[PDB]
């Protein structure tokens, strides 16, 4: 499964945008349902760690088993911290590479582009979105049929291109220069609440 | 203790026991009854039916049965939900779970698994109570 629901209730429940600052929390910044505008008392310190974890899980649209295995894998580095290495491994998945490069507006669109077989790493096609893109691998746009309507238009309007992403808008090749850093990556949510959430799992 | 007392006579811990002991059974067919074969459920035939009144301070008439099991030891078992169809000599299935209404009952029958039938109004937790999904 992935998810198909209204995708905007989700942001109103975390209190974070999740869609490139394009405002879902413009009107009614409160939660969904009857008891939306009428908030109530405090939230535990279990609700806080759960809310941080859900923020990160819904950012990149993955499921709970895969999230937890990625977290367990990031723990075997021991070079740096354990939340930084996590949120950095999270960025190296082929879906974020298409999002950051700029071939798609959303992450759902980028996911459908990499699922339906329209992109290639090093020339060879790769079809599965949880792929692990390493540093220095020019991912391309299937030079067979790169004349599609939405890819073309979403290359023009560059809302955000980062300081670790390289790209050329003629051959349509991009790559990571090097690994990013927390200052360059959502210094807003957390990586410590999420680490504590998995201590008693 | 001194460690010499410990070496003369070691430490011994307490022994734990189930609360569903009639679910580790053995046959009574050829020789005798064997205890290795932990089961999640057992089946049986109900030798009576009816009602009984709870402890202090509850108040009701709670439905129950008495059942003889394949290994030939007898126990009473609660029948849950609203409304059943169980009569003398109908074959049923038991799971663990103890009711806090009266003593002597340590099992539940499972609805919709043999002669017993699922309850016929439910809409909200039909996976218990054994109700199938209605088009409504």
């Amino acid at each position: 499964s992935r998810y198909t629901g209204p995708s905007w209730k989700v942001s109103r429940r975390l209190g974070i945008s999740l869609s490139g600052t394009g405002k879902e929390l413009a009107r009614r910044p409160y939660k969904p349902g009857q008891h939306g505008p009428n908030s109530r008392g405090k939230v535990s310190e279990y609700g806080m760690q759960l809310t941080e974890k859900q923020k990160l899980r819904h950012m990149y649209g993955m499921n709970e088993r895969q999230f937890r295995t990625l977290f367990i894998k990031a723990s075997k580095i021991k070079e740096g911290k354990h939340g930084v290495n996590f949120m950095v491994l999270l960025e190296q998945r082929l879906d974020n590479v298409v999002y950051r490069l700029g071939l798609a507006t959303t992450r759902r669109q980028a996911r459908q582009l990499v699922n339906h077989g329209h992109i290639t790493v090093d020339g060879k096609r790769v079809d599965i979105p949880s792929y692990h893109v390493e540093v220095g691998q020019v991912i391309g746009v299937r030079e067979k049929s790169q004349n599609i309507s939405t890819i073309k238009e979403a290359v023009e309007a560059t809302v955000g291109r980062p300081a670790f992403v390289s790209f050329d808008t003629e051959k349509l090749e991009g790559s990571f220069t090097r690994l990013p850093e927390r200052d360059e990556l959502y210094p807003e949510i957390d990586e410590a609440l999420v680490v504590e959430y998995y201590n008693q799992k | 203790p001194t460690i010499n007392q410990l070496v003369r006579k070691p430490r011994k811990s307490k022994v734990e026991k189930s609360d569903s002991p009639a679910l580790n059974k053995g046959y009574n067919s050829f020789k005798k009854t064997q205890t290795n074969v932990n089961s999640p459920q057992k089946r049986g035939v109900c030798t009576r039916v009816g009602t009984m009144t709870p402890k202090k301070p509850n108040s009701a008439l709670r439905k129950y049965a008495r059942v003889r099991l394949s290994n030939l030891i007898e126990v009473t078992a609660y029948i849950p939900g609203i409304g059943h169809n169980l009569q003398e000599h109908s074959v049923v299935l038991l799971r663990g779970g103890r009711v806090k209404d009266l003593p002597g009952v340590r099992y539940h029958i499972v609805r919709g698994a043999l002669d017993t039938a699922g309850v016929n109004d439910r809409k909200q937790s039909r996976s218990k109570y054994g109700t199938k999904r209605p088009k409504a």
Binding site: - | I3, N4, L6, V7, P10
Partner: protein, 83 residues
């Protein structure tokens, strides 16, 4: 004969049988759970060509091959005699 057998040491304990003596070899070994060292004993039977050695002697023995239902050792030498 470049391969070698096992020799031991002990104090003789019984000398009633003809040509056979029981030797107790003693050692200390530890406890598996707790730490301290307990002493441990096992008895061996050894062969005597002429019924020489007596109790309290401190002997050495060596491993041979089955010489009876129970005896597997022979008498090497007497190190220190009792009086």
């Amino acid at each position: 004969e470049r391969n070698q057998r096992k020799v031991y040491q002990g104090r003789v304990v019984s000398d009633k049988m003809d040509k056979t003596i029981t030797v107790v070899v003693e050692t200390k070994k530890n406890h598996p759970i707790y730490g301290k060292r307990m002493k441990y004993s096992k008895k061996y039977k050894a062969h005597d060509e002429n019924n020489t050695a007596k109790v309290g002697d401190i002997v050495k023995i060596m491993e041979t091959r089955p010489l009876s239902a129970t005896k597997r050792f022979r008498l090497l030498e007497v190190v220190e005699e009792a009086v």
